[PDB]
Amino acid sequence: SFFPELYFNVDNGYLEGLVRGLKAGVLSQADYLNLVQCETLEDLKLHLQSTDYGNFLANEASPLTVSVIDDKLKEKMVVEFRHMRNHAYEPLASFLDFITYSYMIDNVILLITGTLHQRSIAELVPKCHPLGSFEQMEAVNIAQTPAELYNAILVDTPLAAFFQDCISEQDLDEMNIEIIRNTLYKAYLESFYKFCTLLGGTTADAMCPILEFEADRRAFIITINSFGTELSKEDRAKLFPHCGRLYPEGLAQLARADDYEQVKNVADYYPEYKLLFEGAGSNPGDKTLEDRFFEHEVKLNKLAFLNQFHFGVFYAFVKLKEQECRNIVWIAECIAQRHRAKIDNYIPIF
Amino acid sequence: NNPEYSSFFGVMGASSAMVFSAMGAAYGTAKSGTGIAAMSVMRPELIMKSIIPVVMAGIIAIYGLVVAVLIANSLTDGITLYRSFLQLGAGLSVGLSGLAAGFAIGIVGDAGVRGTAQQPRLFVGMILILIFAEVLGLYGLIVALILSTK
Amino acid sequence: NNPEYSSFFGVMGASSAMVFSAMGAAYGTAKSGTGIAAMSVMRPELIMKSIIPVVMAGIIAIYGLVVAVLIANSLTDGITLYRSFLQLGAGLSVGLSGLAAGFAIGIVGDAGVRGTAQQPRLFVGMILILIFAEVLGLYGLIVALILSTK
Amino acid sequence: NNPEYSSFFGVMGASSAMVFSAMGAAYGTAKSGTGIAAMSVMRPELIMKSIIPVVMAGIIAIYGLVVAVLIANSLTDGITLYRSFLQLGAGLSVGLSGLAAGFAIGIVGDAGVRGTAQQPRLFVGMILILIFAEVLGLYGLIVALILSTK
Amino acid sequence: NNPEYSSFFGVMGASSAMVFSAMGAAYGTAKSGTGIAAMSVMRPELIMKSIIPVVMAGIIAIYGLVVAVLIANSLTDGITLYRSFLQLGAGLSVGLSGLAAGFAIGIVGDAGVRGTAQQPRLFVGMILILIFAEVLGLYGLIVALILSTK
Amino acid sequence: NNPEYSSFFGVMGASSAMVFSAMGAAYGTAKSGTGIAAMSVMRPELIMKSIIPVVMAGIIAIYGLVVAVLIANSLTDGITLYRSFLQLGAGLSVGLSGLAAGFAIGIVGDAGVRGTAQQPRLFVGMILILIFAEVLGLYGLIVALILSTK
Amino acid sequence: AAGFAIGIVGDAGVRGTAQQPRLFVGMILILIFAEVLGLYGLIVALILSTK
Amino acid sequence: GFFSPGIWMGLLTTLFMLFIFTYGLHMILSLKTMDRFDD
Amino acid sequence: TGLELLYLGIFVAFWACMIVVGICYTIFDLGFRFDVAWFLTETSPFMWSNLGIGLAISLSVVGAAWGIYITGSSIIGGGVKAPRIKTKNLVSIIFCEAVAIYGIIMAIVISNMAEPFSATDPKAIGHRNYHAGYSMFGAGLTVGLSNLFCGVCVGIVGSGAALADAQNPSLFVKILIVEIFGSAIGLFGVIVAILQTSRVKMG
Numbered sequence A: 001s002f003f004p005e006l007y008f009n010v011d012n013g014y015l016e017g018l019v020r021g022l023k024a025g026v027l028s029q030a031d032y033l034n035l036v037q038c039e040t041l042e043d044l045k046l047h048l049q050s051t052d053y054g055n056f057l058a059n060e061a062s063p064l065t066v067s068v069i070d071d072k073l074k075e076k077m078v079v080e081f082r083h084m085r086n087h088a089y090e091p092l093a094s095f096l097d098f099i100t101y102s103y104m105i106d107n108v109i110l111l112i113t114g115t116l117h118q119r120s121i122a123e124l125v126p127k128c129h130p131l132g133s134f135e136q137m138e139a140v141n142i143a144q145t146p147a148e149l150y151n152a153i154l155v156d157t158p159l160a161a162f163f164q165d166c167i168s169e170q171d172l173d174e175m176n177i178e179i180i181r182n183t184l185y186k187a188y189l190e191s192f193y194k195f196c197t198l199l200g201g202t203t204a205d206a207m208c209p210i211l212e213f214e215a216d217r218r219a220f221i222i223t224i225n226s227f228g229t230e231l232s233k234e235d236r237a238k239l240f241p242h243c244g245r246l247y248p249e250g251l252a253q254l255a256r257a258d259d260y261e262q263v264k265n266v267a268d269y270y271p272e273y274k275l276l277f278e279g280a281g282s283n284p285g286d287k288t289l290e291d292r293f294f295e296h297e298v299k300l301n302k303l304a305f306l307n308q309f310h311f312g313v314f315y316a317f318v319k320l321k322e323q324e325c326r327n328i329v330w331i332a333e334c335i336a337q338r339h340r341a342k343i344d345n346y347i348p349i350f
Numbered sequence B, C, D, E, F: 001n002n003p004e005y006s007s008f009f010g011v012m013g014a015s016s017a018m019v020f021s022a023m024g025a026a027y028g029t030a031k032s033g034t035g036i037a038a039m040s041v042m043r044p045e046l047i048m049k050s051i052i053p054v055v056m057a058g059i060i061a062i063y064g065l066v067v068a069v070l071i072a073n074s075l076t077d078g079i080t081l082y083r084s085f086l087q088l089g090a091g092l093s094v095g096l097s098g099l100a101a102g103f104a105i106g107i108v109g110d111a112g113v114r115g116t117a118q119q120p121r122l123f124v125g126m127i128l129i130l131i132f133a134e135v136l137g138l139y140g141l142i143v144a145l146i147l148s149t150k
Numbered sequence G: 001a002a003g004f005a006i007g008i009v010g011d012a013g014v015r016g017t018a019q020q021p022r023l024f025v026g027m028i029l030i031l032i033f034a035e036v037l038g039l040y041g042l043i044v045a046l047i048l049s050t051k
Numbered sequence H: 001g002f003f004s005p006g007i008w009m010g011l012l013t014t015l016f017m018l019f020i021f022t023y024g025l026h027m028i029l030s031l032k033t034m035d036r037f038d039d
Numbered sequence I: 001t002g003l004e005l006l007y008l009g010i011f012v013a014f015w016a017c018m019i020v021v022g023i024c025y026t027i028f029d030l031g032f033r034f035d036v037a038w039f040l041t042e043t044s045p046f047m048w049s050n051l052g053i054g055l056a057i058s059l060s061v062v063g064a065a066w067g068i069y070i071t072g073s074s075i076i077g078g079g080v081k082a083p084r085i086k087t088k089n090l091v092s093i094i095f096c097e098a099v100a101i102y103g104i105i106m107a108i109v110i111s112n113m114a115e116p117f118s119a120t121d122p123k124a125i126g127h128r129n130y131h132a133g134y135s136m137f138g139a140g141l142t143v144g145l146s147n148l149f150c151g152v153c154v155g156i157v158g159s160g161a162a163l164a165d166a167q168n169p170s171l172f173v174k175i176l177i178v179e180i181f182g183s184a185i186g187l188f189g190v191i192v193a194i195l196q197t198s199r200v201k202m203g
Ligand SMILES: CCCCCCCCCCCCCCCCCC(=O)OC[C@H](COP(=O)([O-])OCC[N+](C)(C)C)OC(=O)CCCCCCCCCCCCCCCCC
Pocket: H001, H002, I009, I010, I012, I013, I014, I016, I017, I020, I021, I022, I024, I025, I028, I030, I033
């Protein structure tokens, strides 16, 4: 074993304690029930004020909206993550940067989509996710030139490594943005898994399961969604990350798969995914496959907190708080639309 | 009479017993404790049951202490080179066997405690594996006693 | 008419026989325990069936103990340098063969239990591979006995 | 008459022939078992046909045992230092050649079973590669015999 | 007349000749087997035509075996220190030349088989590069034979 | 009468008491300054309060300087081996104790400056931990004052 | 050791003073504390050499 | 001889001090500076 | 991994040199030069005794500081959102420092057994003085290393305990038992060192 116990706290111990303290503030099942019992968005804020969230929503206008609540939750998480990153050192700094690459991918996809449609990049900036902000000025004032934007990404963005999967800037106008996004995400997930493995120790032990499940769920959902589309099997198989546990012949069977029944047969070989697919009834009124995978992801991120001397705590906390913000936004949506029947679809955490 | 340097190896035998058995017990207790503390936020009622691997690591420390006391009581400034070597070997045996058993107990106890938080049925399996790892230190103590008494 | 440092090599043989065998058994037990804990969350019923690797590593430790006690009882004050070297060779042979077998058992048991959670049929194949890994330590024991009872 | 340290190199030859061959066979068995467990998830019927790597890895340990037993029998009180060098060289040759052959068998068998999980026609090629990686241990055994029997 | 330790370097020459040559051949075989396993999934009918790198590594091991057996047949009790050094040098030359040749064969064979899985014309280039790597072990054998027979 | 080299150990003890204490205090100062710089961008009013860990690292350096000055003023031409090695032991004690205490002070202060920036109440807790970290080096100095004046 | 301390502290301080001008005095004090380590080394060196 | 008693004592003392200094230098070289500052 | 590469290279080179040196000394019949007797004997007992005292104190302090930083980082990090950690979990620091207190106690006990010889010939120095130096060195090693490991273990366990307390107050009282068990190892080392230096007499 790497014996991280000896040296982890030299640099990252204070942040380990800090992130665990932050995780202790994620709403529990009782708090989720209390928020569910509300009647209006104002009452939602009122109940939420008793949790760790506090007065994050007191300043904003009395006529609360789901949009306002969602933006405030996003802003709070961005602030906390930015504080942790600012107080992090080299290895944990790279870990947190890898966490942010996920949103930087979507942001660059937005940038290229707007540019190919001749829209100002500066005017596209506000829609980008805060955690993936392109503070670099090389990819700004591009004059709506896709070639200039590709060069800017390559020169002054951490995505230059993932953009070597493509062959040239003509690929931006050639390939569909979804395929670009998913190729970028495959490369990013593979690099993230490699980095975690190189870190080794408790970090690898507690983090590789999460990335592996991410890869497997990406494979499953890409297969299930590309059935009725023009996305050929050959071009689909290029989008499966190789980190998952399906790499030997599992991804191959999925690539050859031509129906949800075949996808389920492939998933059967792995019991962990077998249960998720069995519970994913997919008919109206019961948990869908995406919801089952969300439950499994939350479970894995929670188990990430049973290890101690590892960076996986930060990724798990970021994902758990993302899920919590999604849950609160969903509860606010149910309150606003008066659809109390489905108000229990939120995936609980802790 | 015997060589002036003879007692060096018996001294190092007692020291090696104590130091290496202490290393093993310390690692076992540290790993098991960092497992127990992390788990207990999730399953607070399992702490007392999960304390057992810590006790096994302490037992490794006890074996090391026993052999070290034997050597330090049987060690004199004029002990034959033969007896000094015997005590060096007994010390190395107990210390390194306890080191291995402590590493094994730390790993097994941490993993088993985390699993028991998730799977209560695994407690007995964890206890079996911990006994099997503790029997290694017991073997080391047996060999150390044979050597030191011989 | 023999050196008084002759017993040093035989004592190191006994100490190594116990120590390295214990380290290999500890690696086997630790890895197999981690595997059992990981696989027990989903498939609790397989814990006792899957405890085999720990038993095999314990048998490796027992090989080491057997050879260590044989050497310890074969030791003597006027042990010729020849017999001392024979016992050192037997101790190194058993200890390091058991160490290699313990590494093999650790890896194979981890993989086997984790797979048998997914593939029930893999149990017998894992048992065969573990038998080969144990046979390695058995070979080491045979050589150690031949060397230590000349 | 002859130096008293020759038996040390003789027993070093024996213990090396055993230990390094055991380490090579252990690595081969561990890698092959990891590969077998990985591949058997989807293709259980090949669990037994994919055990040839482990048998071919155990053959290396058998080579090492043969040389170690030969050396241990040839050992005696008055072996010339030249005969002790011969035995040490035979042991080193068999042990390290078997260690290299075990590395090669482990890697080749792991890759071969993983591939055969997807392409049945690769089994014969894997068998031939394993034979080519086993003749290395065979050559080591031949050289060890030529040195020891001399 | 001659020092009693002269044959140490001769036995080391034989052992090195075999061991390092076997290590190089084993590395070549492992790398080539990994390449063959990787390629055979898509292009299975090329396995037999692609087994060549393993054969080249086997030839390197045969070079090592030839030199080792020659040294072991020219090794005598009254071996002059000069001839012992000659044999040690021959063994090291062939062994390490074969180790380098096996490294080259492994890398080139892996790359060439992976490429030939996509570009059929690359087969002849791979054979040429493998011959150019083989001649390195051939030169090592030449030098070792010259030194041994001198 | 006494060896001409007897003063080397005392000189090196003084040099160590200075150097290792200086390294520990430098680590403490560097880590605490990093923490203070990171914190100050948002809480400028806490710089003076948070400069305490730097002062305690300076105190570690002062203990080192004191013991080094004592040994350097006690060195003499006819310094016996007894006094020389007493001073070597005192220097090692002070140097390593100050090194470890400085490491602890640096780490704890870097943590606690940032913590107090967020939570004002943590200042007293940070001070409480830091005083223990410093009295570790103080214990080293106490043993040095016992030894160098034994 | 004092050079290590001064490098780390001064780099951090000069980079953080671009953000907070009030950190200059803190950086100066920490650098003084780092320099007194070299001064202690010099004091012991003089005591020894001029002994 | 290659070594004498004084050389042996000095070498062991210098070896212990080299170990201590190597530990300290390792812990110092492991020092890292922040790459970002809070807004 | 540059520094680890340097350490590994030094280790491998040193031990390859030792292997070849031992082979040479044995094979060339020059074993009589490899006089471990002469080494242990000419090497002054004062070196061993004072290295032992220095190690007893220094390694104990090293372990105490290791554990103190390991657990204080966690205490202070957790207390940013739950300051009660600072007031409650100081017991872990107390244990980590009791390690160093044991260290100084054993340094005193060992140093009390020192005394000059006024002899240089080994026959004059005698078994009593040689064994005294060796046993003081061994006791220093025992106490220092046992205290180092116990302090590191208690620090790891205390960081775990502080992190667990940051989330649920009623857990530290049950997790302190692990700290007590880890603390017992330092006491064991102290007892063994005392037994070793029980009948030790330089003079
Ligand atoms: C690379 C990292 C940095 C270095 C860190 C490690 C440093 C290791 C410390 C080296 C000092 C070793 C002790 C030297 C004295 C013993 C020498 C000896 O046994 O020979 C003299 C002994 C005794 O000699 P003697 O007693 O007959 O000589 C008369 C006595 N004197 C000389 C004192 C007057 O045996 C011989 O005579 C052998 C002659 C041949 C020399 C063989 C030496 C072995 C090493 C040679 C190869 C190098 C190995 C490294 C390989 C490459 C790297 C992996």
